């Protein structure tokens, strides 16, 4: 499913993401956008390390989830990658909360670093009532 802007702003915030580890809702919304276009079914296969990025946040199968088909898997989220492909993002959000608790925080997502970090991201939450 593809979330509309404010729809995602409200569910992410309902899941207590607004200010999680200092990361604002707007900044979470900017990650989602540049990562998958707000699409939960988004998946990106990297023939390189043979890993795959899953769901709305494009979490990689090599360190966070297990899809049973990528070398050197750690599965730090103790979750199946297939859970990151559901209409309900509770599972993906909880795993993301885990990703950012790591030293690098949100700077883990290079898409967010390129398109979000240090920039104005208040349009992502504009008029959403959040």
Curated annotation (Swiss-Prot):
Coiled coil: none annotated. It is found in: Secreted. Keywords: Amyloid, Amyloidosis, Antimicrobial, Bacteriolytic enzyme, Disease variant, Disulfide bond, Glycosidase, Hydrolase, Secreted, Signal. It catalyses: Hydrolysis of (1->4)-beta-linkages between N-acetylmuramic acid and N-acetyl-D-glucosamine residues in a peptidoglycan and between N-acetyl-D-glucosamine residues in chitodextrins. Belongs to the glycosyl hydrolase 22 family. Monomer. Lysozymes have primarily a bacteriolytic function; those in tissues and body fluids are associated with the monocyte-macrophage system and enhance the activity of immunoagents. This is Lysozyme C. It comes from Homo sapiens. The gene is LYZ.
């Amino acid at each position: 499913k593809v979330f509309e802007r404010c729809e995602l702003a409200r569910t992410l915030k309902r899941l207590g993401m607004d200010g999680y580890r200092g990361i604002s809702l707007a900044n979470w919304m900017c990650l989602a956008k540049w990562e998958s276009g707000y699409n939960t079914r988004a998946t990106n296969y990297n023939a390189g390390d043979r890993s795959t990025d899953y769901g709305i946040f494009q979490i990689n199968s090599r360190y966070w989830c297990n899809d049973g088909k990528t070398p050197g898997a750690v599965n730090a989220c103790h979750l199946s990658c297939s859970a990151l492909l559901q209409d309900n993002i509770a599972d993906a959000v909880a795993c993301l909360k885990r990703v950012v608790r790591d030293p690098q925080g949100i700077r883990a997502h290079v898409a967010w670093r390129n398109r979000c970090q240090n920039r104005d991201v208040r349009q992502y939450v504009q008029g959403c009532g959040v």
